[PDB]
DNA sequence: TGTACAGTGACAAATTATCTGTCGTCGG
DNA sequence: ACAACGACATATAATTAGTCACTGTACATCTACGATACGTAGCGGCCG
DNA sequence: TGTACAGTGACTAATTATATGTCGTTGT
DNA sequence: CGGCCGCTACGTATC
C-alpha cells in the first residue's frame with residue numbers, strides 16, 4: 175500500500191533547523207557549500223558533523239527529519255514480561271463474570287505473588303495502573319462506538335430469519351413494541367395510581383405514528399389488538415383534544431415487525447394476521463427496531479419530562495418529588511399525548527430526508543388510496559376457541575359459562591370454532607367447518623344473561639373466587655360472584671375505572 | 682465474589698443470577714476472616730499512627746469484666762404484664 | 766471546602782471572609798519562614814486579586830515554618846510505612 | 849445503514865468599551 | 877586538499893516505576909419480580 | 925467539622941535509545 | 953367396571 179507521512183506543529187525548535195536547511199537547498203560548489211555549513215554552525219551551536227547529519231536526515235525523510243523522533247522504548251515497560259503478563263491476566267480474570275476487580279486489588283495480587291516468589295521489586299501500584307491503562311481505554315472506546323444510518327430512500331429491515339424486508343412504500347412494514355411512560359398518574363380523586371403503558375404502531379417507510387394505545391393495562395395480545403384497530407381504522411377526535419391538524423392516517427399493513435414478546439409471538443396475533451392478510455416478522459435485536467424504540471426517547475425529551483409527576487428514565491435519576499407532585503389523570507395525559515402526535519410529531523421533518531414531514535411522506539408514499547374497512551369487519555380481532563364441541567341439548571360450555579344458539583341443537587356431537595370478545599363474553603359467534611372452510615352458524619348467548627355484560631377477566635375472577643368458595647357452577651352463580659365484588663378499593667379495579675372512563679369518552 | 686450484583690440495578694452484572702455459588706456459611710467464613718485479619722488490622726484514618734484494634738485496646742478506661750453468657754438473658758423480650 | 770477551608774502541607778486553614786467561595790478554586794501565597802497564616806487570591810483574566818487571609822487550625826501556638834511542616838508530614842509517612 | 853432529538857464545536861455579523869491620532873490647554 | 881560516512885566513545889532527555897498530598901464519590905432498605913403467552917397434565921361427569 | 929478508600933495531578937529516581945564529538949577511512 | 957370429554961393446575965419462555 176501507499177505509506178506517506180506529514181509533519182505538523184513543526185516550529186518550536188524546528189524553525190531554526192528549517193532556516194538552516196533553507197540556507198542549504200543547493201550544492202552550489204564544493205568550495206562554497208562547506209562555507210554555508212560552517213556558517214549554519216553559528217545558528218545551531220553545533221559542529222560540522224551535526225549539520226551534515228541534519229542535511230542527511232532532511233534529504234531522506236523531508237520535514238519530519240527536522241523533528242526529534244520518539245525513543246524506541248516509548249510504550250514498553252521495564253518491569254519484565256513476567257510481571258506484565260501477570261498484571262494483565264490478573265485484571266482480566268478478576269473482571270470475569272460478575273467480578274469487578276479494581277487495579278488496586280490487582281496490585282494486592284501482585285504483592286501476594288511477589289511475596290511467594292521472594293521478589294524484592296514487585297511493580298508499584300502506580301505502574302499497575304499504567305500497565306492496565308491501554309486495556310481500560312479499549313473498553314471505554316468499545317462502549318462509545320457510533321453507527322451511521324440509513325441514508326436516502328432505501329431501507330432493508332433485518333429479521334431473526336436472516337431475511338431482510340425491503341421497505342418500498344407506505345404501509346409495507348408496520349412496527350410495534352411497548353414501554354412505560356415516565357409520569358405517575360392519579361385517579362379522578364387525586365390519589366396515586368401507577369405509570370401508564372404506551373404502545374405505538376409506526377409505518378417504516380414514512381416513520382409516521384400510525385396509531386397508539388395508552389392505559390394502566392398490561393402488555394397483552396389484547397393491547398396489541400387494540401393498537402392494531404386504532405392504527406387501521408380512520409381516526410376521530412373531538413374538540414376537547416383542541417387539534418389544529420388531522421391524524422389523517424389509516425389502512426392495513428402488508429407486514430408487521432416486532433420484538434419477541436409473548437403479545438406478538440402468540441396464536442391471537444397469528445389469527446389476526448391471517449384474517450387481515452399481514453405477515454408477522456421477528457426483530458433480530460433491539461437495535462434493529464429503532465423506528466419503534468426512538469419515538470419513546472423523543473417523547474421523554476419533548477413531552478413527558480416537562481409534565482408534573484415525572485419519574486426519570488431510571489431510578490438513579492428519579493426526581494424525589496415524583497410521588498408528591500403527581501397531578502394528571504389518564505384522560506389528561508391522553509389529551510396531551512394525542513395532541514403532541516397530531517400537531518407536532520407527525521408534522522416534523524423526516525430526519526433521513528430533511529425536506530418532507532413524516533405525514534407528508536406517508537400520504538405521498540401510498541401506492542394507492544386504500545378503502546376504509548367496515549368497523550364490523552374488525553371482528554377479526556375476536557379471540558378463537560379452536561376445538562370446543564357441541565353438547566346434546568344444543569349447548570356449549572366455556573370459561574364456566576353455558577351458551578345456547580339458534581340452530582345449535584342441529585349439531586350436537588360436532589366441533590365448532592368460537593369467536594368471542596374478551597370485553598364482552600355474554601355472546602359467542604359460532605363458526606363450523608364445512609367443505610374444509612369456516613361457515614358462519616349462529617350468535618350463541620349465555621342463557622339468562624342476555625340482558626347482562628361480562629368481560630373475560632370478570633368471569634375469570636368470579637370463577638377463581640367461586641372455585642375457592644366451594645359453590646356450584648352456573649351462569650347466575652358466576653354473576654352472583656361478580657355483583658358483590660362489583661358493589662363493595664383495589665388498585666387494579668381503581669385503574670380499570672379510570673381506563674373505562676377514557677373508553678367511555680371514546681364512544 | 683461470584684454472584685456480585687453491583688451497587689444498584691444500573692451496575693447489575695447480567696450474569697449475577699447465572700454466577701451465584703456461595704452458601705451463607707461460606708460468605709460468613711470470608712467476611713469474618715476479612716474483619717479479623719484485614720479490616721480491624723488496617724491503619725485508623727483521622728490518626729495514621731495506630732491500628733484500629735490497637736486504638737480500641739489502648740483506648741479502654743479499664744479491662745472490661747466479661748459477662749457470663751447466661752446473663753445475656755437480659756436480651757429476652759418482656760411482655761410488660763400478664764395477670765396470674 | 767465548606768465553611769471556607771483550604772488544605773496546605775496537611776494542615777487545615779480557615780479563611781476570614783472565605784465562606785462564600787466554597788467549591789471555587791483559589792490560589793495562595795505564604796512566607797516559608799512562617800505558614801501559620803496564608804494569603805488567598807482569587808484568579809481572573811490577567812490578574813490574581815487578594816481575597817482574604819486564612820489561618821492554620823489545630824496546631825501548636827509556636828509559629829510554624831514550612832520546613833517544619835514538611836518534617837511533620839514525613840514523620841507520619843514513615844510511621845505509616847512501618848505497617 | 850438503528851435512530852432521531854438535544855447539546856456542542858466551528859464560523860460569521862452587529863454592538864460597544866477601549867486603544868490611537870490630532871489638536872487644544874495648562875504647567876514648569 | 878575538501879567533503880561524506882562509519883567506529884568508538886561520551887553526555888543527554890524520554891520513558892517508566894515509585895512516592896506523596898489533595899480530591900471524588902459511595903455508605904447511607906431495595907430489582908428479583910410482575911405480566912402475558914404456550915405446552916402439558918389432571919378431576920370428575922357422562923356414556924358404554 | 926459526617927466518613928474513609930480508590931483514583932489522580934505533581935514531583936523524583938533508575939534505565940535506555942539517542943544526539944554530539946573526535947578520529948579513522950574513503951571518494952572526489 | 954372401564955373409557956372418553958369439557959374446565960383447572962403446573963411447568964416453561966419472554967418483555
Ligand SMILES: [Mg+2]
Pocket residue numbers: 351352433435967
Ligand atoms: Mg419489547
